[PDB]
């Protein structure tokens, strides 16, 4: 009595792993009560393909926009900047919508502060390339051109 699981399940469960359980536990609890199913061979492919059409399928369907920064590998036109201050140094900060101002017409338009560098944001030269939140993995690269007026 092997059977494959549905839900988690105490000392064996795993959403679909391949356990061998005592007959009784099964035909008396696990099954007829939605938690497992006979390992009927017809099934070990029925619940093995998913392990293919998914764990190797949709785990690949993720890669369709590498780094998301495709043809943006040559920086972006500096429409304005991101500010400055302290007669030479830096003084001004980025509002909850002020790192787009420069790259404010490139890809698509948004306006939120998924902050990534929990520092006082260094005040020096100007043009830097960290990463920012583009996704749960990849990154991106561009620069920042101030405004002399």
């Amino acid at each position: 009595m092997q059977v494959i699981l549905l839900d988690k399940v105490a000392n064996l469960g795993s959403l679909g792993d391949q356990v061998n359980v005592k007959a009784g536990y099964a035909r008396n609890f696990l099954v007829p009560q939605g938690k497992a199913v006979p390992a009927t061979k017809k099934n070990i492919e029925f619940f093995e393909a998913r392990r293919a059409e998914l764990e190797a399928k949709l785990a690949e369907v993720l890669a369709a926009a590498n780094a998301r920064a495709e043809k943006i590998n040559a920086l972006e036109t500096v429409t304005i900047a991101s500010k400055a201050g302290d007669e030479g140094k830096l003084f001004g900060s980025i509002g909850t919508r002020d790192i787009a101002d420069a790259v404010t017409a490139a890809g698509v338009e948004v306006a939120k502060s998924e902050v990534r560098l929990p520092n006082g944001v260094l005040r020096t030269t100007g043009e830097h390339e960290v990463s920012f939140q583009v996704h749960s993995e990849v990154f991106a690269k561009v620069i920042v051109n101030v405004v002399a007026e």
Binding site: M1, A23, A26, R27, V31, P32, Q33, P38, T40
Partner: protein, 77 residues
């Protein structure tokens, strides 16, 4: 009727054979049990009278298939 609804097992007749090799008519009869099986396919408890083995056959063939028989054979269930 000590009979296994699923496998057809009834009682049989045999001897006892002593050390002296003594014939004594008798009966082997099935390990029956009549169990309450869940169907879901029918949201209900069909409660067959089954022999261990009859049980094992359900654990393999699947209840929906075993009830497929009987139904198709004329039996109640």
């Amino acid at each position: 009727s000590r009979v296994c609804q699923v496998t057809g097992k009834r009682p049989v007749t045999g001897n006892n054979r002593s050390h002296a090799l003594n014939a004594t008519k008798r009966r082997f009869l099935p390990n029956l049990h009549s169990h309450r099986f869940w169907v879901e396919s029918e949201k209900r408890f069909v409660t067959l009278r089954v022999s261990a083995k009859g049980m094992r056959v359900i654990d393999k063939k699947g209840i929906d298939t075993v009830l497929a028989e009987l139904r198709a054979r004329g039996e109640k269930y």
